[PDB]
Amino acid sequence: VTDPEALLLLPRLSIQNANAISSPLTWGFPSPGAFTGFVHALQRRVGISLDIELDGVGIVCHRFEAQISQPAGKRTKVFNLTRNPLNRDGSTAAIVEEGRAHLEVSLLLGVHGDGLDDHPAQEIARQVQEQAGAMRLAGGSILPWCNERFPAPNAELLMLGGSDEQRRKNQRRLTRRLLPGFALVSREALLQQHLETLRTTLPEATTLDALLDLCRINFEPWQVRDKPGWLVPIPAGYNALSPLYLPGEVRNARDRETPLRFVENLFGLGEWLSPHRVAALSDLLWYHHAEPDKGLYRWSTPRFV
Amino acid sequence: QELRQFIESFIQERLQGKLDKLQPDEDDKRQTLLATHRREAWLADAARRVGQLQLVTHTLKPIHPDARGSNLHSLPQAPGQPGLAGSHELGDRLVSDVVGNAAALDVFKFLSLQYQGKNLLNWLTEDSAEALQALSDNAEQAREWRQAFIGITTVKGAPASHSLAKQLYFPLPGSGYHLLAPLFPTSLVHHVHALLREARFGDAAKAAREARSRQESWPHGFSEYPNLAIQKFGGTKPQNISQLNNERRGENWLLPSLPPNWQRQNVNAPMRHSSVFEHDFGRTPEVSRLTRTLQRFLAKTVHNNLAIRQRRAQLVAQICDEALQYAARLRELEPGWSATPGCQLHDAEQLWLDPLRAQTDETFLQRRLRGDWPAEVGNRFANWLNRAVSSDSQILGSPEAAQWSQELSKELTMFKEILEDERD
Amino acid sequence: LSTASVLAFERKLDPSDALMSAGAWAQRDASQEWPAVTVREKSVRGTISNRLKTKDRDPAKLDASIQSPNLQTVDVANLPSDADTLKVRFTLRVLGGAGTPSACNDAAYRDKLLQTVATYVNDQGFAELARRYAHNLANARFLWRNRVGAEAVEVRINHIRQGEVARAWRFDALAIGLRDFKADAELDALAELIASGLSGSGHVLLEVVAFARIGDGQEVFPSQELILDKGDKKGQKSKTLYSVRDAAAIHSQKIGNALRTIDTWYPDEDGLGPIAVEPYGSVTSQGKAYRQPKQKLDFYTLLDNWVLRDEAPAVEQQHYVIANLIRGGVFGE
Amino acid sequence: LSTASVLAFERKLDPSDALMSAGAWAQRDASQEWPAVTVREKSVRGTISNRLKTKDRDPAKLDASIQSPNLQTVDVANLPSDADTLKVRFTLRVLGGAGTPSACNDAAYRDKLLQTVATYVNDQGFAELARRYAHNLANARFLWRNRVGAEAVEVRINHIRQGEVARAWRFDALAIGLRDFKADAELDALAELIASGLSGSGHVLLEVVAFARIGDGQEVFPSQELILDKGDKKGQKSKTLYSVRDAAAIHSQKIGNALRTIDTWYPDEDGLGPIAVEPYGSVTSQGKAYRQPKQKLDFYTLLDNWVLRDEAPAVEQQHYVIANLIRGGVFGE
DNA sequence: CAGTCATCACCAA
């Protein structure tokens, strides 16, 4: 909601062994729920000793590879597993399947606090990076440096105090540091828009998302067409099955302080657009916003349109 | 009351199915007890083993091996925003899986065969007039069946969770946190799994593929799902999980959601006699679809022109950013860019998409591209991209030549200003 | 007081994936630019050499199929014919806060546990377990089959705190045995650093490089990933090796499993070498679980007696109980 | 007591792949810079020279296919016309510890197996096995089709400790035969080195160099690649010869086959030459299997009698069982 | 005489 003044680039985050299932109906790149949980986990450890805030994340995703294998006679995939230790009788344990992938990621944060005028912003950049290099980005660890120990420091720059001409040179200087990536935004208006193509059939909604991430072909009145983006099904929050429980009610909870619901996933849509296609970089940022009483929990990116 | 033969085929069918279980050493009580209690005590076994299970729509057995907890049983509500729908706005053709005791899910088939043939699946618990005439039991037996058959759809145990569950935190707008414990949508994954098994294979989705194979097809829609992934639940035995067997077999099919740029090639722009000068176009493997789209979307007229006039406005950026990504993932992304072999022609590509100076950096290395006008790659780019936006005598003489060359001019205008600030 | 129904410990001693690269010995001081060992595919003709099943005893098929061949497709990773030295490089983050769980139900159980851990720390710090972590760094145990038959092994460890090096160690890993934690002042200066990182006090980030002279063009052994039920067509691929980008590699969990071979104190037969730290302390190659709860020295029994009942075990079992907290786990009711 | 359901034995006697180069005699002791024999693809006009099916034998096509030519594309390697000598160079590690499995399920069976192998070792070493491997190194068995009709063959073996060499042997590989195991005192000095490798007494790395005087421009025979699961059109390639980077080569498993042709102890025709060490003694290229399961001389009968039921075989079959354990494999039930 | 620990059949396209 609150537009930040300065954006914080976390330039290279080579992370290993992230989760790659992310919902019961998708696989591949992890959910942006992991990224906004990561930035509020930065908020509870750094942002109070700097008296700043950090709300939104610019998910860029330079590289991607998944620990998958192509079997014989199939065009599908399976996942490469770990070998778990034995049971107490010496026999072998069962198999729970955890997909796994390596990533390389850039990040764009948003500051809102009095520490930006109480400090140099280099203090904010150094402290946020040196603490975030001891955390887990999606489900896996954040790696230290290598041959790539030259892009290690950050950058940070405001947008309100300054001229209004060479800020194009400034944000396209920023774009020189995230140039091979594909940003990930929320494009859920097209899920509305592809019901009118099915309005001749029914006003149903659950099979509309399963129409866009594939190759639909009819014959000549072969029918291939340019898909209008890199449009992919992402998960987009939780919807309540069960009423809110008082913090001593549910057996085997993580906490004895917070209240608990039983929820399940809701599915949206995204696109892997290059950052050139959007003018202002503050459009990309992902935010948590969810109303508590009726149980709809959701994350999206505002300011995209 | 001609609906007791289902009870006959449930009792005597299983009793005759135990004909391969022949042990001539110690069956002298097992065979007699099986013949006796397989019929009469089968109602007792289906009463005592009718209370180990429950109906579900939020199972947790499919998220951990032995996570003994409480499974949900009600559908989620409607999401109040526009543009995102899931396991609550699904249709009224839902199917509740039956999680419970793995060695007790055989009486569930005899209890749920009443939704096959007749319409008396809702006659066993309530409306036992469809369970008095062909049941052939007394008041104690009819009451015991109507009591034991209510423990499926109702609650089985206490509402709880487990240590192997997820239970995420969510920040509230101006408050603390709620714990969100997500569940596995067994009903939704059954619906999408049956939906995709008729879309990847089946009658029409494969007969249209043979119609393509006979090269004579009229328009009819088939579907193709490339690069999925498979996940197994349970393992060698998936019947310990809820049903997962009717046509699931522990194989929920996962749709791909990958990033675009995670399967790249290698950057080889060396000092070659054509790998320096002939590499002024950006010959990549992912531009064939864009060239084919710009070709095959140029023949339609403006008789349906309320949608096709909003795609070439983004294609200039969608082809210029490809050259930007190539020149910034090959030159700077590669660790080297040497002098061109046959430098009288292989030097302009080393000027435009080239890295910084190196160990062969003499005096005149940071004094040519640091002061030379970096605006010569505009006309060559317009000639290259204007070869895929080809001119025609029926295109230049028509009113589409200016309306398709203005886009190439507006694309070539800004790329020189973008790439004229790296050195100069 | 009851045991907490949700316990979960974040791991410490977090390693990366190893990377393999080939070069020559005494050219190993300029080894920042050796080329990476790639995974090569090959197909293989062989013989039926398994116990055939007489369950379906056929006097026609199972005797002639002994005579007929067996065609398979595997992976392999070799050194080049002009390289005799294998280089393996990874990094190791040590975190600290080695007694604080990531999820606990009651804060009273948390208060009963955290002062027990601090009572363990103040009288005898993490130095005595950091010695045995620093040993398994110093002798190159993470080279699993790559040490077997190697002639000279050298392990280099660099403490990095900034852009560049702070402190550097050199070792001869074959002079340091796999069974005998004989401490010496070359690595007690490493053990104090790993202990001061496990406390939570100072920064620690190691860079571990291991050299192993093997032979010209020999076969090195990167990690093989479990692929359960792949290739129902018989034109399949049996062995599949693990590769990070254009390099042979070892999984991170295998390197961590090599680093936490600490347990010498197990009560079945202690004179057989240190095993990996596990609850119900077991070993998958041996096919057997040492440290069985009938002989009440596993992790659940000792943790409950030492937190809930204050029955302190011996110091040697306490090192095991703390090593399961550096290892981390997921516990329940 | 049963055998374990999982057994894995690592290979001992692990060779690399061999690479081919060419030159002339009297330069064979300055042969370090010979150029490699290269792989060349050629195209062949030939003749239909197979049997003809009578199941759809239409004489319009079948009687007319004979008269018309046959076009095939193959691969061939030759010596240069300047040179007359093949050179083959590979390395060989001898590991030791050849009775201890690397994966098991039982512990009692593991101790029974280790004390059985120690019973074998501490009354007779590996010397009968080591001199048979030294025979197969001393003649040039590993040159498979290349030595056939070769005029003179010389085999040089070097023992390597560092950059410098420690011990050197030279031989006449045509005086030593393929069916005898008659030796001299010079081969026993190699047999004791291999037997000190197999018993873990020392580190053994060997460099085996074989020269074969064949002829000017004659054809050499590298190993042929098994190309599996193609599904292609009319044979775009029908013979692909194995090479490494710009050098023709032999697979490591074919040299490994040639070194372990040790078995002269098989029942029917033990006077008719040694065969390789397999569990079921099968020679696949000759289409039969010595050591059937019916005559109780295969590995899965003798192993189970000798380890479990204390039924020690004859010594000549004990050599077969220990050779199968130097080999390796999956010997589980 | 009552908790608890290893085993035991129960299912299952």
Curated annotation (Swiss-Prot), chain A:
<comment type="similarity">
    <text>Belongs to the CRISPR-associated Csy2 family.</text>
</comment>
<comment type="function">
    <text>CRISPR (clustered regularly interspaced short palindromic repeat) is an adaptive immune system that provides protection against mobile genetic elements (viruses, transposable elements and conjugative plasmids). CRISPR clusters contain sequences complementary to antecedent mobile elements and target invading nucleic acids. CRISPR clusters are transcribed and processed into CRISPR RNA (crRNA). Cas3 and Cascade participate in CRISPR interference, the third stage of CRISPR immunity (Potential). Absolutely required for crRNA production or stability.</text>
</comment>
<protein>
    <recommendedName>
        <fullName>CRISPR-associated protein Csy2</fullName>
    </recommendedName>
</protein>
<dbReference type="GO" id="GO:0051607">
    <property type="term" value="P:defense response to virus"/>
</dbReference>
<keyword id="KW-0051">Antiviral defense</keyword>
<comment type="subunit">
    <text>Interacts directly with Csy1; part of the Csy ribonucleoprotein complex with a probable stoichiometry of Csy1(1),Csy2(1),Csy3(6),Cas6/Csy4(1)-crRNA(1). A Csy3(6),Cas6/Csy4(1)-crRNA(1) subcomplex is also formed.</text>
</comment>
<dbReference type="InterPro" id="IPR013398">
    <property type="entry name" value="CRISPR-assoc_prot_Csy2"/>
</dbReference>
<dbReference type="Pfam" id="PF09614">
    <property type="entry name" value="Cas_Csy2"/>
</dbReference>
Swiss-Prot record, chain B:
<comment type="similarity">
    <text>Belongs to the CRISPR-associated Csy1 family.</text>
</comment>
<dbReference type="Pfam" id="PF09611">
    <property type="entry name" value="Cas_Csy1"/>
</dbReference>
<feature type="region of interest" description="Disordered">
    <location>
        <begin position="66"/>
        <end position="87"/>
    </location>
</feature>
<protein>
    <recommendedName>
        <fullName>CRISPR-associated protein Csy1</fullName>
    </recommendedName>
</protein>
<dbReference type="InterPro" id="IPR013397">
    <property type="entry name" value="CRISPR-assoc_prot_Csy1"/>
</dbReference>
<dbReference type="GO" id="GO:0051607">
    <property type="term" value="P:defense response to virus"/>
</dbReference>
<keyword id="KW-0051">Antiviral defense</keyword>
<comment type="subunit">
    <text>Interacts directly with Csy2; part of the Csy ribonucleoprotein complex with a probable stoichiometry of Csy1(1),Csy2(1),Csy3(6),Cas6/Csy4(1)-crRNA(1). A Csy3(6),Cas6/Csy4(1)-crRNA(1) subcomplex is also formed.</text>
</comment>
<comment type="function">
    <text>CRISPR (clustered regularly interspaced short palindromic repeat) is an adaptive immune system that provides protection against mobile genetic elements (viruses, transposable elements and conjugative plasmids). CRISPR clusters contain sequences complementary to antecedent mobile elements and target invading nucleic acids. CRISPR clusters are transcribed and processed into CRISPR RNA (crRNA). Cas3 and Cascade participate in CRISPR interference, the third stage of CRISPR immunity (Potential). Involved in crRNA production or stability.</text>
</comment>
Swiss-Prot record, chains C, D:
<comment type="similarity">
    <text>Belongs to the CRISPR-associated Csy3 family.</text>
</comment>
<comment type="subunit">
    <text>Part of the Csy ribonucleoprotein complex with a probable stoichiometry of Csy1(1),Csy2(1),Csy3(6),Cas6/Csy4(1)-crRNA(1). A Csy3(6),Cas6/Csy4(1)-crRNA(1) subcomplex is also formed.</text>
</comment>
<comment type="function">
    <text>CRISPR (clustered regularly interspaced short palindromic repeat) is an adaptive immune system that provides protection against mobile genetic elements (viruses, transposable elements and conjugative plasmids). CRISPR clusters contain sequences complementary to antecedent mobile elements and target invading nucleic acids. CRISPR clusters are transcribed and processed into CRISPR RNA (crRNA). Cas3 and Cascade participate in CRISPR interference, the third stage of CRISPR immunity (Potential). Involved in crRNA production or stability.</text>
</comment>
<dbReference type="Pfam" id="PF09615">
    <property type="entry name" value="Cas_Csy3"/>
</dbReference>
<keyword id="KW-0051">Antiviral defense</keyword>
<dbReference type="InterPro" id="IPR013399">
    <property type="entry name" value="CRISPR-assoc_prot_Csy3"/>
</dbReference>
<dbReference type="GO" id="GO:0051607">
    <property type="term" value="P:defense response to virus"/>
</dbReference>
<protein>
    <recommendedName>
        <fullName>CRISPR-associated protein Csy3</fullName>
    </recommendedName>
</protein>
